[PDB]
Amino acid sequence: GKSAFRWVPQADLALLDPMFTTVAMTQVHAQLVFDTLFGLDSQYLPSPQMAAGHTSENDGLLWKITLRDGLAFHDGSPVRAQDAVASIKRWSKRDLMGRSLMQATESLTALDDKTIQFKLSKPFPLILHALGRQSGNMACIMPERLASQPETEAVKEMVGSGPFTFAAAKWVSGSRVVYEKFAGYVPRKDDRKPDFAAGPKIAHVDEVHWHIIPDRATAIAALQANEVDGVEMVDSDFLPILTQDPNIKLVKRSLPTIGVMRFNHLHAPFNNVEIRRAVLSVVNQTEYMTAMNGADFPEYWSDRCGVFVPGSPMDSDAGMEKLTGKRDIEKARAAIKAAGYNGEKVVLLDPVDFPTWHAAALVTADLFKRLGFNVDLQTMDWGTAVQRRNNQEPVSAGGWSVAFTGNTGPNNLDPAGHLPMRGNGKQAWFGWPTSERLEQLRIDWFNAPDLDAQKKICREIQLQVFEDVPYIPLGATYPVSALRSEWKDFQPQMSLFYTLHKA
């Protein structure tokens, strides 16, 4: 009699503590079992979820957050402010955003069992954005007895307040994970349409069953045979069959993989900003996306990708002509020669066993040869290339010059966790670009008073990325999930099992 949603995750579930690890499947698990003080909508803006509201006083140095009525943990005990305080303190040990919030917090206390109080040293306008984090790491609320565990010891007992309970006796490694609708869950008021994690969270199925199927062809066959209801990760090879199947609905997920060309900024030739800007002037995202993804399903990639997720609030047209304008090879060749390039060996790391990034390496090798570079395209396994790109030494000592990879997830929405834009030198992501401007602009975004101010700073960040070229975006590739056609309102921002429904 129980209704169930049968789900094929992209990987098995290995860890249960959402504060302990950022791995994708733990964060999906977390959105079934736990809840957050604030949710994010499709514009990734915060709104009350477990909270009823908030107040800001004393010139933004004193914040009060009130819990709404009807919150309960899966053991029946109500959620209090003391549980939220203990959860936030533990969550802030490993979460980047929570760490920044508590660095600005003088004291975090519960005034009663319903009101949370932040006493701030300096203003932190991103406090609601912080407490609204949905993944990596979800700002999940646990009972104080569990939130008091050390941040270095992963929590094993699953007691959340979210719309599903974790059936621990049904977690079978390599085979099954089972979640059961929390009968005691009281969704917040229905004053807005459910949208990502904003509005009421309603479970419309009695159970969610993860079917672990490592063979991707087997998983697709189960979906077409109506043996499962959804598959998290659909490879491009299966796009023709699934598009033709009228019983299957393909879901373009909201957050893409932004492909990046990453230089080694520590040695010639890409320690020279004029050479980096010359390469930027001939990168054609249409060519990269066509080679990496094919031309048959262009609805799942974008060739107009700047620093941030295309179409998201921080995205803008600032300086985008640096990518969308004419790709002039002759002028770029002349600029590289004028900059002083003299045939130095340029090592490209080619991961032959990773098809998309192998394709990006091949496009770049041909482009660099036409630019006049002395190209050394080194073929290796992806795991080898990941080790090689950590070397900071020059090419003469076995070093590298260009590498190719992708950045996924909400980090690409804003400067907080954005990896390639960072400019703190040898403390930055591999490649180690130095841009004091980009570092200061990121800090400016943290201190920005409102959304309009944040957007203006992210325009400047994009202008500065094109000027200093810490990396070059190659395009955005959107992952795809597949569902049986009867399932509606599946949220595309994250694999979520509330809101979705059949009837």
CA within 13 Å, CB half, 175 = 5
Cis peptide before 246 (omega within 30 of 0): no
Query: What DSSP string runs through 459-500?
Result: HHHHHHHHHH-S-EEEEEE--EEEEETT-B---SSS---SS-
SS3 130: helix
Residues 380 and 351: their CA atoms lie apart, in Å, by 5
- 2: number of Cβ within 10 Å: 8
Helix pair 329-338, 273-280: axis angle to 10 deg: 180
Name residue, tokens 């980090």: 411
* Strands ordered across the beta sheet of 257-263: 301-302, 472-477, 257-263, 402-407, 345-351, 374-380
Structure tokens at 96: 């980047």
Residues 118 and 265: their CA atoms lie apart, in Å, by 41
Q: Quick one: which of 185, 193, 192 has its CA closest to 160?
A: 185
Residues 121 and 125: their CA atoms lie apart, in Å, by 12
Conformation bin of residue 44: beta by default, left when phi > 0, alpha when psi is -120 to 50 = left
Q: Which residues pair with residue 116 across a beta bridge?
A: 65, 110
Q: Which residues pair with residue 55 across a beta bridge?
A: 64
Residues 422 and 406: their CA atoms lie apart, in Å, by 15
- 193: number of Cβ within 10 Å: 12
Sign of the dihedral through C-alpha 95, 98, 104, 110:
negative
Residues 391 and 135: their CA atoms lie apart, in Å, by 31
Domains of the chain and any CATH numbers: 4-212 (3.40.190.10), 257-477 (3.10.105.10)
Residues 88 and 33: their CA atoms lie apart, in Å, by 17
Helix pair 436-446, 451-468: axis angle to 10 deg: 170
- 292: number of Cβ within 10 Å: 24
Structure tokens at 389: 């790109």
Q: Does an H or E element contain 331, and which?
A: helix 329-338
Q: Hey, what amino acid is at 362?
A: L
Residues 469 and 21: their CA atoms lie apart, in Å, by 31
What DSSP state is assigned to residue 188? P
